[PDB]
Amino acid sequence: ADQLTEEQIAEFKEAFSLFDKDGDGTITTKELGTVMRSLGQNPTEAELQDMINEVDADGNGTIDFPEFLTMMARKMKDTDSEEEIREAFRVFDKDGNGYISAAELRHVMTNLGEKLTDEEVDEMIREADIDGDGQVNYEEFVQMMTAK
Amino acid sequence: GSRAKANWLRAFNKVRMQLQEARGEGEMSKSLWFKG
Ligand SMILES: [Ca+2]
Ligand SMILES: [Ca+2]
Ligand SMILES: [Ca+2]
Ligand SMILES: [Ca+2]
Numbered sequence: 418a419d420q421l422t423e424e425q426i427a428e429f430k431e432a433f434s435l436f437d438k439d440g441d442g443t444i445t446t447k448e449l450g451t452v453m454r455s456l457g458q459n460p461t462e463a464e465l466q467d468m469i470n471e472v473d474a475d476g477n478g479t480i481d482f483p484e485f486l487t488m489m490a491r492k493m494k495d496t497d498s499e500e501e502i503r504e505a506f507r508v509f510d511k512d513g514n515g516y517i518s519a520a521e522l523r524h525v526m527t528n529l530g531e532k533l534t535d536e537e538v539d540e541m542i543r544e545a546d547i548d549g550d551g552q553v554n555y556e557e558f559v560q561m562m563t564a565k
Numbered sequence: 566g567s568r569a570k571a572n573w574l575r576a577f578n579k580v581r582m583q584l585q586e587a588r589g590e591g592e593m594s595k596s597l598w599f600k601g
Pocket of ligand 2: 479
């Protein structure tokens, strides 16, 4: 499924062992601090955590081998969804997280017709709430529109 | 009843169509490093 060539990934593995000094299978902005500093670039700690947490998928503030490699592959058409469901979650709750609450869902309701109350949201969440938490997680949303 | 069926449908679907709007936009998250 749009997999990189063994030579491209293999070369990254060697560069990873030489570039990575933490001894972990992931990349950390600290390592970036030392490399960018060596090439004449010394960004502030804020830019380090920012640039690193944005380049890695999920944004844990570090780029794992698959996260960085996936971003490089993103240049080529990978999947039709392209994680577009994340954008749905980002709009459901400006908050900046991936969880839809009964109120936030009512906000998406606002986007269409129908006016709803705490009852109509608890019911809509009752359907997706497989966890029984009265809220809808990422897998629940895709369980509705994707139902994989 | 069925209040959630049509509304909720339009809900997750409301963002589903909205996801396309975000696509086709310039993103600088890659920043340096990715250039290599
Ligand atoms: Ca590391
Ligand atoms: Ca990450
Ligand atoms: Ca939320
Ligand atoms: Ca749930």
